[PDB]
Paper text:
Mitochondrial ATP synthase consists of the soluble F1 and membrane-bound Fo subcomplexes and occurs in dimers that assemble into oligomers to induce the formation of inner-membrane folds, called cristae. Dissociation of ATP synthase dimers into monomers results in the loss of native cristae architecture and impairs mitochondrial function. Although overall dimer architecture varies among eukaryotes, we find that subunit-g together with subunit-e form an ancestral oligomerization motif, which is shared between the trypanosomal and mammalian lineages.
Using masked refinements, maps were obtained for the membrane region, the rotor, and the peripheral stalk.
Residue numbers in the entry:
A (entry chain I): 11 to 75
B (entry chain H): 22 to 182
C (entry chain G): 2 to 280
D (entry chain V), E (entry chain U), F (entry chain W), G (entry chain T), H (entry chain X), I (entry chain S), ...: 41 to 118
Amino acid sequence: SSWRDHGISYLKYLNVCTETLHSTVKESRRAKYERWSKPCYTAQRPDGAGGQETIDKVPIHTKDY
Amino acid sequence: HDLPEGFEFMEHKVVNKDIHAPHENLETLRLTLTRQDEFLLREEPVKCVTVTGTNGEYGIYPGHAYKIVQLNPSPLTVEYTDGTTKKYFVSGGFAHINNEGSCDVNTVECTLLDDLDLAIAEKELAAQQAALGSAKDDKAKSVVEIRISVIEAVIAALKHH
Amino acid sequence: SGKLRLYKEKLEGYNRFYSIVKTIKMVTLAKYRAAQGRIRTRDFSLRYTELAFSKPQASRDAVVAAKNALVYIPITTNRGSCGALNSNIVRCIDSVVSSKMVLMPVGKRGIDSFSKLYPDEFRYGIINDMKESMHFGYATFVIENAYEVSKDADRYQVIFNRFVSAGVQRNAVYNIPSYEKWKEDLADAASSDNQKNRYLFANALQNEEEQLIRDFFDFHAALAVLNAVGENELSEQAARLVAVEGQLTNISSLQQRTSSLYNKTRQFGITAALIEILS
Amino acid sequence: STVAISVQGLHYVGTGLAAIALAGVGLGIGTIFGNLLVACARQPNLTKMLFNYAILGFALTEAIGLFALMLAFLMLFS
Amino acid sequence: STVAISVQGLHYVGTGLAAIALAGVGLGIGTIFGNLLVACARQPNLTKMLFNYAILGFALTEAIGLFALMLAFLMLFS
Amino acid sequence: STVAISVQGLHYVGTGLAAIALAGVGLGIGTIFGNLLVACARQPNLTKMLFNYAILGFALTEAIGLFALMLAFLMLFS
Amino acid sequence: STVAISVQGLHYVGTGLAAIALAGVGLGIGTIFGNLLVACARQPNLTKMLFNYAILGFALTEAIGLFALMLAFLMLFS
Amino acid sequence: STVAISVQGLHYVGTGLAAIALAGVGLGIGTIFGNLLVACARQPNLTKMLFNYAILGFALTEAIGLFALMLAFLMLFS
Amino acid sequence: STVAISVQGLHYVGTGLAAIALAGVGLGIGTIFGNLLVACARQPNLTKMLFNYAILGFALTEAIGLFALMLAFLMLFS
Amino acid sequence: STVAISVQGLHYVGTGLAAIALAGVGLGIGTIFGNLLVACARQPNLTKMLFNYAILGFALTEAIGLFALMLAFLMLFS
Amino acid sequence: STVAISVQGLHYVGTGLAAIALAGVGLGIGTIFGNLLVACARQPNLTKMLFNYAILGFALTEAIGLFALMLAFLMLFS
Amino acid sequence: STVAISVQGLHYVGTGLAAIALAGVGLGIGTIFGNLLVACARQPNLTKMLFNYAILGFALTEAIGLFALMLAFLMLFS
Amino acid sequence: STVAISVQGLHYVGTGLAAIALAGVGLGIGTIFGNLLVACARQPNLTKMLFNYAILGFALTEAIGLFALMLAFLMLFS
Ligand SMILES: O=c1ccn([C@@H]2O[C@H](COP(=O)(O)OP(=O)(O)OP(=O)(O)O)[C@@H](O)[C@H]2O)c(=O)[nH]1
């Protein structure tokens, strides 16, 4: 609705919807469903020193959108 | 050197009916309900499927015209020819309807309405309403509105039956 | 004195190595058992994605014709010991070297292998901790990063491993053209008698708005990426099992060799000492 | 001069004019049913509801036509 | 003066006006079938039901037409 | 010269013309009870609110219908 | 007094009015075929049933037009 | 030669014509409530603002209708 | 009294009214072709059948047009 | 001969005709608002620009209506 | 008594009534070209064929208008 | 006999008829703006451009009304 | 017996009836430009092309009105 005007893409909207739906699940089943929405992905580039410089091209969590 | 394409390993193709061909009266619809590259139903024959699209609800019966529907967070009903109703809830995705008698509903998340609970939705809605006032900026407000809409749809689906 | 001690010490080391590898085998077998359920539930999500993107095309014209960035998103595993999957992916990438090539690999091994070989064609890589199930959010992250790497990109080629069977892991490709080229092809299919299999699909897409079409495009690209990563994970597990079994066999052979040498050394030393002492 | 005139054949003309109202009535009815079909082809499970509402519409537009008809009779027998 | 006059020919004009009601009725009927097609293409499996409803709509619109015709036949033959 | 006439029968003709005002009125109602159906299929959960709004629109159109009917009756019994 | 006047030409004007009904006939027919095309574009394999239903609708609307023509010819030859 | 005639009944005819405009008003109202419902189905969250805008449109259309009705009534009593 | 009149020019009036029928004919044709284009936009490979059906509908409407024209010619040349 | 006649009540007729010009005006306004609602449902963030354009359209349509009403009042006072 | 009255100014009314028929031809052409514009955006690759079909439809509507003008001129002169 | 009759009030009637033309013009203008809204809510980035075209259409459509209005004045001031 | 009457003021009625035809032309132009505005928002890249076709329609829709307008003069100045 109003999220398009702010530049939020469709995929982020889908991720938010799925996260909310999982949060609405019963206590017992959530243990499974929550495994399909927890962010565990990151962007890295190897620098000269060897440190894995982390990129900020795309937000990982929904609150950062 | 010619690499394959991942679609060659999937032999369950899509049957598209030709333009200049005779009509057939179908009594069942082949449904294919999918969540994150995983199906719950595999070409299951059903009497009808009710899907809540963006413009409005669609009641798909055998022989429906070819169409593409952009789903919204909402319930999805499947009624078999036997007379048994199965209700899911979806958070998003697409529905492809074919005039040959097939309906492929590919959702990001499709979970049984029973699995959902009421009090959890109410408390999450209250928390989102409280956070809306403290939204950092416009984007946070839009995100909280999205979450609130999803929760309201879930609660309405639960209260309906 | 020294020979026997060294042989026994290295034999003990090999024994510990074998035990560690056996534990690794058991853990990987548990993971393979958990992940094998996908096979029943696959090969049905991507049906209209085929119509959206499946196109029998030459491997030369599609490459030379483009004059904008050609993004490549090879799928690679975080941990080694998988086998020849990463090597084959690297070979496939090398065969497709071009001035327009851009790499956004996935996995630590892919990053470490494409950073050195291709420094000027590498921007950054994505990493996922294999803690949760491969979900849609990860695919969306990959797609968003790919777009931000090169928004004016001719195509986005995903290279992954397809797990045909327990012992067969081929290399598969998903090609994701730019929105403009996809729109042109879709319009040609809808109007012209050519592409007769996509005529209804293209006409259905055209009837709808443009935002819906763009959302459809992004959604099916994400689905393709999700399928790729899932198949790559399954293939990685299978190849890890195979390579672990091979390593176990090699370790057992080396332990047998060392035991034979230890027996020979002890007998030789005992007899030599006895002869030179009491004779 | 003060010529009071009573043309007896005019009460036909007015009657006909009243009947023209039915043109906007019948057409309206069609529209309802038209949409009804499109509403049934979208959510057939709701037909038993929609039909009632459609009937209600016909029960209102028709009630309008009667009024016109009433005039078309009052002027046709007076 | 009191000049009553009986112009016979007027009983034709009114009749013609009544016929104009058929302009609506006809159109309305067409509209129904129009939508019917758009419905029968959308969900052919329901054609039968839709057809019945379409007939119902016709059976109503034509009814209005009857009244108009009656008026005509009640003024042409008068 | 100075001349004046009083044609009584004309009081019918106007009464007919006012009746034509109902042609739109009835049609208008149809439009409402058309879209209502299309609205109830898309959002069956909102049948009550849409029905109330349709009743409101029907009353608003009936107001104009009664205005025209008042004009017609006044020109009929005058 | 009462004055019976038998005008001859008034049997023409009414005729010309009845023909106006055909305006609401032809348009309706157009509508039908219009929708038909759209239907054949949406469900082309269902062309035969749509064609037959459109023919039925055309027959009914043409029957209405034939009634109007009956009235027109009755007045023209009267 | 000069003949000045004051026909009294004509003031009825015009009055009726002034009422015909009401149709174009009444139909319009339905159109508003024909689409309002759809909007309420498309975006139920805006059930309030859309209602106010529709009321504004109805008020303007009713102002037009009253402007016509003033002419209708002035000629009925003069 | 017993009286009888015959006006020569009235046969013009009716003729014109008959021509008004064509207003509902030509428009109808446009409607058809309108929809035709839309159909040809979403089913380019089914153009021949759509064109044939459009021609059929045009001829069917032209039948009504020719009926009205025949009435007009009968009232203009006699 | 060279006869000349002036009729008094004719200005009531023409005036009424001008009032019919307000039928398409009011209807037009409704149409605007109709579409407006749909637009506000499709793009709810544009609740003010669309309102401004609707007001502009109403102003132009009302200017046309006032052009007609000027004639309607002027003939009524001639 | 018998009166053979020949009014010399009645052909203007018939000519105007016939000219009214162009209100349908113009609207039909407008509908044709509106649908043409809608279709070209939908499927721009077929612009030429759609243009040809629209030209055909316009030619047919213009033929109808030519018939109406033939009647109008014939009445105006004859 | 042969009488050169000159009626004076007729110039009102014709004038009123001309005003009926505006009933279309007004309506047409509304249609434009209607679509304009549906076009601004479908691609707001083009709003300004769209607005310009809309104005152009008005400046054309309005012109037609002026023609009709001119005729009215010519007959109303003669 | 044979009586010849030459009414001088009847050309006003015919001129107004001819002017009535401009309503259809205005409505057609409005429909054309509304469809243009809708289309451009769907395929902006081709806007210019669409515009040309729209103008063509106007060129082919205004001309008809001219003919009607022409008749008006041919009766207003005669
Ligand atoms: O201005 C417009 C025009 C059209 N559309 C959109 O274009 C599409 C045309 O779709 P259709 O007209 O072909 O189908 P439909 O009546 O079944 O539509 P739905 O109920 O399924 O929506 C529909 O999805 C409509 O919402 C707009 O969103 N805005």
